[PDB]
Design a protein around this ligand. Structure first.
Ligand SMILES: C[C@]1(c2nc(-c3cccc(N4CCNCC4)c3)no2)CCCc2sc(N)c(C#N)c21
Ligand SMILES: Nc1nc2c(ncn2[C@@H]2O[C@H](COP(=O)(O)OP(=O)(O)O)[C@@H](O)[C@H]2O)c(=O)[nH]1
Ligand SMILES: [Mg+2]
Length: 168
């Protein structure tokens, strides 16, 4: 049968979670997507010759640590932790997202990828070395993306599928 992979995109508001998700789903850059919309989107993709079904949850809204929200995030098999390379605060928030994923999944080795988005912009404030070194501290991959040009979009999502495959 066709394997379905449940992927969750997390990170601060404004980092480009919806833009990255829509680039994967529509193959189009969407510069405007209601920042309050949290929803899931499916796509069949060929990753290493295998057609698999991706189910992408694009998160949104304020933090809520209820039993119901934890139950819903626990359905995720892998997580993209996204920051924007021109927003230092979004990068400094990454550790909080990683800690919450580890808590709900009750595991130290949840499939996860660090994503530095907005790589097309010249206003960089987070050095690539700092981001690579954070991924190394966590023992995860780091992917540089741009939802605008499509740089790294398949690399981010497909690496996460490969991290789920190795974890199973
Ligand atoms: C979605 C997620 C999550 N979202 C946040 C979140 C959201 C908005 C702002 C912030 N800010 C951090 C920096 N300080 C200001 C608040 C943090 N944290 O984790 C990440 C995945 C696992 C789980 S489980 C659970 N109950 C969550 C929630 N709600 C989550
Ligand atoms: N230049 C550039 N702008 C981006 C990129 N991704 C998102 N944006 C912009 O960043 C803002 C936030 O994007 P959005 O996808 O709504 O972020 P979300 O709140 O994390 O879902 C919008 O103004 C987007 O046009 C990207 O890779 N490059
Ligand atoms: Mg959004």
């Amino acid at each position: 049968g066709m394997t379905e992979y449940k992927l969750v995109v997390v990170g601060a508001g404004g980092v480009g979670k919806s833009a990255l998700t829509i680039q994967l789903i529509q193959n189009h850059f969407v510069d405007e997507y209601d920042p309050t919309i949290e929803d899931s989107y499916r796509k069949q993709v060929v990753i290493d010759g295998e057609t698999c079904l991706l189910d992408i949850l694009d998160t949104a809204g304020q933090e809520e640590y209820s039993a119901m929200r934890d139950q819903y995030m626990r359905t995720g098999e892998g997580f993209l932790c996204v920051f924007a390379i021109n927003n230092t605060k979004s990068f400094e928030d990454i550790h909080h997202y990683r800690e919450q994923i580890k808590r709900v999944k009750d595991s130290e080795d949840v499939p996860m990828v660090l994503v530095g988005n907005k790589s097309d912009l010249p206003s960089r404030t987070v050095d690539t070395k700092q981001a690579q070194d954070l991924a190394r501290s966590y023992g995860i991959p780091f992917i540089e993306t741009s939802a605008k040009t499509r740089q790294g979009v398949d690399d981010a999502f497909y690496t996460l599928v490969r991290e789920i495959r190795k974890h199973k």
